[PDB]
């Protein structure tokens, strides 16, 4: 998570995808319809930084 290659595809058009981004689900706010989640920020964008 949070590093280069956090998600990987064998080919740009491939149907496979290994993902490891520390995705977790938080409880929805009271009286709200949404799916809260918490993730490590993108490893590609951090690598570009």
């Amino acid at each position: 998570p949070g590093a280069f290659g956090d998600i990987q595809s064998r080919t740009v058009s491939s149907s496979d995808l290994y993902a490891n981004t520390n995705l977790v689900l938080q409880r929805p706010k009271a009286g709200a319809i949404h799916v809260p989640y918490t993730q490590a920020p993108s490893g590609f964008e951090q690598w570009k930084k």
């Binding site: 709200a32 319809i33 949404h34 964008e45």
Partner: protein, 53 residues
């Protein structure tokens, strides 16, 4: 131009979704923003919303 919109609009029905700020508190907005992508270069952003264009 009409060849690009057989399905992206003609069967789509914009919706109303929760917004965190509608000029008074929280909200069920008709223009709720779902995603904002700014990975381009010269300040161009693609914005996904609940409205339709």
């Amino acid at each position: 131009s009409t060849e690009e919109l057989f399905n992206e609009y003609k069967l789509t029905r914009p919706y109303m979704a929760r917004c965190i700020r509608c000029a008074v508190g929280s909200c069920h907005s008709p223009i709720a923003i779902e995603a904002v992508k700014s990975d381009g270069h010269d300040g161009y952003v693609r914005l996904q919303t609940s409205s339709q264009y």
